A paper describes a structure:
GSH conjugation is essential for the detoxification of xenobiotics. Previously, we identified a novel GST obtained from B. mori (bmGSTu2). We also found that bmGSTu2 was capable of metabolising diazinon.
The crystal structure of bmGSTu2 was determined at 1.68 Å resolution and solved by the single-wavelength anomalous diffraction (SAD) method using the Hg-derivative. The purified protein was crystallised in a space group of P41 with unit cell dimensions a = b = 86.26 Å and c = 58.77 Å. Two discrete domains, N-terminal (residues 1–78) and C-terminal (residues 89–233), were connected by a linker region (residues 79–88). Similar to other GSTs, the bmGSTu2 structure adopted the canonical GST fold. Superposition of the structure of bmGSTu2 onto that of nlGSTD demonstrated that the α-helices and β-strands of bmGSTu2 were conserved across the structures. For GSH activation, an electron-sharing network was proposed for a delta-class GST in Anopheles dirus (adGSTD3–3), and the network includes Glu64, Ser65, Arg66, Asp100, Thr158, and Thr16221,22. The corresponding residues in bmGSTu2 are Glu66, Ser67, Asn68, Asn102, Pro162, and Ser166. The decreased LD50 value observed for the mutant after diazinon exposure indicates that bmGSTu2 is involved in diazinon tolerance in vivo.
Residue numbers in the entry:
A (entry chain B): 1 to 116, 123 to 209
B (entry chain A): 1 to 115, 124 to 210
The structure:
């Protein structure tokens, strides 16, 4: 496992990359970055990721940051035929969209509230993000975020939603989200264990 | 049948999708969304994009929002062999990274300022410094390769908003050369950016 992932134990983007690597059976070495000590802020770390954020992948000297791009690369390079990242352009676009939607909106709004500051408008924006994902699940009428099977689009949304559970936020009125999120735990308990370990830390 | 793009005349994500469609010679119908009238906030618009943001693509009933995903889709669907979006996993990852970097960081920091505080100004310079760093390490003429890719358009249009406010970024040697070389090598594509720049300047 010469593939190296620099990650943090309670960070949803890190968890998503680990779940994908585990689901794809791609061996890797995990480096727990010492966030409290500022390890991601050193020049050595910036040699790998000039953005100074976690995670970053080192694939035989190829340094790749941005967890969405890391998710896409692990599939494209090591499992190009896997349904975890379909090759059909339309099906692939739904996955790509859901990845962008998590980065641009869903995780952005949810984490602003589940971290640090909790305001009426922040609470409203959590509900708007849930409403939009609920809307997407209603329109596709799929069991998972981008298809009727698990894809890399699921992991970032799962780990964003996990932070709501971490603060005992009730989102059960979002029927399809609640079912999708809980079905994930039952169908993929090994992958959920990665989210659950972080959830207990965030708690 | 013709693609339909719902866009706004002064929005960098809209401009990037138009440049890609034009570069790939994919024909489309342009719908200029009436932002001032709130057209992107109606229920009919939300049928296409529940996020209520611009742009959104309608490809014969397939509704796709998020400009980065739209860029990837038009390449994957209509020009899979194009060097504008390489198929080699590593080369593709550099493109994908640069798209994410624009969305998460470069456009986020630059637009917060060009649309002003000491910390916001510092964050503009950090974003420029990071992109300057990436260009130095790849030693490439463009953002992800020695040829134009879809990664270039979002970064070009983020950088255009600095020019729109007369922000001097010439200290960033490689960014300045890359940006100005784009205008000279691709004048038709730059005309799309320039028309918005004149609106933003007003």
């Amino acid at each position: 496992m010469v593939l190296k992932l620099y990650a943090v134990s309670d960070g949803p983007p890190s968890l998503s990359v680990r779940q994908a690597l585990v689901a794809l059976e791609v061996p890797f070495e995990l480096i727990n970055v010492d966030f409290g000590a500022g390890e991601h802020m050193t020049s050595d770390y910036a040699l790998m990721n000039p953005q100074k954020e976690i995670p970053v992948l080192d694939d035989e000297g190829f340094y790749l940051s941005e967890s969405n791009a890391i998710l896409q690369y692990i599939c494209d390079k090591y499992r190009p035929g896997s349904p975890l990242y379909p090759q059909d352009p339309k099906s692939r676009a739904i996955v790509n969209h859901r990845l962008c939607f998590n980065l641009s909106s869903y995780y952005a709004n949810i984490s602003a509230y589940t971290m640090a500051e909790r305001t009426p408008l922040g609470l409203k924006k959590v509900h708007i993000s849930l409403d939009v994902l609920e809307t997407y699940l209603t329109r596709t009428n799929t069991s998972y975020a981008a298809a009727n099977h698990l894809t890399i689009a699921d992991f970032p949304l799962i780990n964003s939603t996990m932070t709501l559970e971490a603060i005992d936020f009730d989102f059960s009125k979002y029927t399809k989200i609640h079912k999708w999120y809980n079905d994930f735990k039952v169908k993929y308990p090994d992958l959920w264990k990665i989210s659950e370990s972080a959830m207990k830390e965030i708690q």
